[model samples]
Target: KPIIKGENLAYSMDEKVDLMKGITATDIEDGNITSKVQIKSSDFVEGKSGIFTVVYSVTDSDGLTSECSRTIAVTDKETQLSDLNWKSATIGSGSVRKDRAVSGNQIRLLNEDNSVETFAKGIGTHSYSEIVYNSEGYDIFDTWVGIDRHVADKKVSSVKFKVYVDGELKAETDVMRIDTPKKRLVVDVRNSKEIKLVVDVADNGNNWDHADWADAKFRNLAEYDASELNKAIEEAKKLDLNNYTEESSEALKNAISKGEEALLSKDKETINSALEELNKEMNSLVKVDLNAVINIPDKYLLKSIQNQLNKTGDITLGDMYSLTTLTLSGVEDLTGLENAKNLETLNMDYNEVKDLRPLSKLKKLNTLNAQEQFIAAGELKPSNGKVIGDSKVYNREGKNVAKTIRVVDKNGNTILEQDAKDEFTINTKDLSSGLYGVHVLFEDEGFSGVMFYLFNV
Candidate 1:
């Protein structure tokens, strides 16, 4: 004989339930056939409200089979609207006496049932209410509202409901009558600290002006933190514009000072303005002209570097004959780089340089910023016999996986190698200063590429 066990299930509309939690099947000869049981029919939908059915069946070793079914009912949970944290105010006539007030205006809390039963008379009569909540902590506010039931049939009166968050109008309802349907409102107030609800009498006449904000409450929706603004301010203060003129530095400093002041006072507008000014000043600084300083004589190449620098920042290349470290990021073309044979450290990040063959002529070059480019995997040897510098390796994918990094000399001799995790830094402090190559290997799921920066010691 075979038997099947059926289990009853219940869940809230907003909740999830595992249908196979208690459903089982067994046979007298097979002992337990629960593992072999198959779900023949199921209509249960996740995150939905409905009555569903799930049927299970199992066959014994001898081919004897038994089947059973269970009904799962998803019901809506009761949400109590009690003791709302808000207050109401009346602006003009038909004002009700209140136990509390805000800014010299009479105000009162909702009734014991979380309903606002207020009346108004005449054309100028107005009523206002606001829900005070922590906007920085919550993401949304939801509630239902309608005209008071007591005055649902009153045709002589009409009311308007308007919603405001952080002094900005968010939503408004049409002129509500006694027969108006109860309307639900959901608002995103993650950036607001206060919500104001205004109910005013229509110009038609205020014979029986009654209004209700039934079941008004907030939802727990969190938003981004305010500390991000402080972080932006700090980043602006750390801008390295020393290569620019004193006037440029002074302008940046002024903007940074204003940004700091705004952050201290928590002024959103001023903070935004100051940050914009800081970024603009930083981007407009004059860049070093490699062609002009080195007398490349190639007008087209000089114009290309100058045009690129117009959009990006300046690179100091004056007196390049003696210059060692040259940081020329944002320059797409490195055609004129061969002129700087004395260059050792070249930072060319955020560019489109693909070929490293041009760098072979730079005998003294040991450090190269080849990040965000299309360079292949291999050893980069300098013209000189050996080189010494620092090399930085970063994981572009930002995954928590181990990587293999190996450093080799010109003779292909492994100088340093290790299994690194996250970001790895290779310092040549212990090793002799010489030309070396770096290779980073990664084997993680969904992982992308890596970035490397070589520096001269």
Candidate 2:
């Protein structure tokens, strides 16, 4: 009689497994006959995860045979929502975002000082949002759901989440509030055709219904449809618009928007079309503008720019040129300041900034913090007389919350708003000599107010 032996195995759902690898055939009549082992049967699904049994058989030269069965554990490496294509989304106020909150930075789930907890992978959506996806051959959907901690106001935000498979509700979350802990959701999407994640408005009427589905993923996807589209988005983002002609940059910008739309859409045709158009526009870039050799090595500049622009993506020189003020205390170097010639004020102090020469090319800079300095507009000896007014607005923590400060006209329209919060200087070079009111607006712990500094120009 022949004996068959093999060990149980485990593998990822998408990979093929060989049942006969360790199996050997041995017989008393034909000693050590290990070459004739074969797989007889298996109860395994190609793209699903579960424990399955596979039968192995072997035969000796004497025609005697024996069979054995081994258990195989097939598991799936959950596919992130960032890698999948959404079929459709009905967002209450804003569009959905992958790996980030809808308006601000990435999905932040942890408090300050907790490393890496700021970057929570997921989809960001407002209240009353339903995001659908193609669920063919998928068995399980999982994610962590919560309200975004960075919303403008918590009392205005309350939401509940629901998951559906093939239009049938699979799981629903309780009403989540500003202080609610992020909850886990797992839905069985086995053999389903479609999966949908829905965020319902709960009691608050959707004022700032900023919600999130963090680390969202699905198991057992046979293949990815959004792989190429994601690659194109990455490629398009790396392009520096200043290096290309203005017209080509405009064309590429439109193409990127179109591609992003396709990525947000569910249609396969839209994705393919957008991809072709993206490549076409990318290749059509003709002239190389050597003027923008500086691709900002420090993100502190872009972070400030992103705050002003209200959205973040590629770094474009246009926004940098338009920005009037940026503070870079946390920045280590200034390698790319030449691209932003129109900057009026740059605030930095007490740092070992190695690359200091980039400031000379900037023709518009007027203010710099000396950590201590009263350089009031060069004595009118350039001799311009400058006025300085000191004001204070401290929060409960005893910290002054400096937000917006502006020199406004009598009609209350802003003439010049400033990023410098301490005492501001009114110099002859600042205006065409007129009456102006210094206005301010800022908030703090339990106290929000404004201020005004009489009249000056």
lDDT of 1 at 456: 36
Question: Which digits, one per residue and each the tens of the lDDT, describe model 1 over residues 351-450?
Answer: 4443445555677876766555423434433334343322232222233333566776667798777875444455555656656556555433222234
- Candidate 1 achieves a global lDDT of 0.53
Deviation in Å, model 1, residue 410 alpha carbon: 99
- After superposition, which runs of candidate 2 have C-alpha atoms over 4 Å from their true positions? 1-74, 110-116, 221-457
TM-score of each: 0.26, 0.33
Worst 10-residue stretch by lDDT in candidate 2?
A: 372-381
lDDT tens readout by residue for model 2, 137-208: 665677777778777355767899999888998778899877677766756666788898999999968878
Clashes of 2: 3
Clash statistics: count for each candidate: 7, 3
- Model 2: colliding residue pairs: 379-383, 380-383, 380-384
Residue pairs in clash, model 1:
138-221, 139-221, 152-178, 287-314, 386-435, 387-434, 387-435
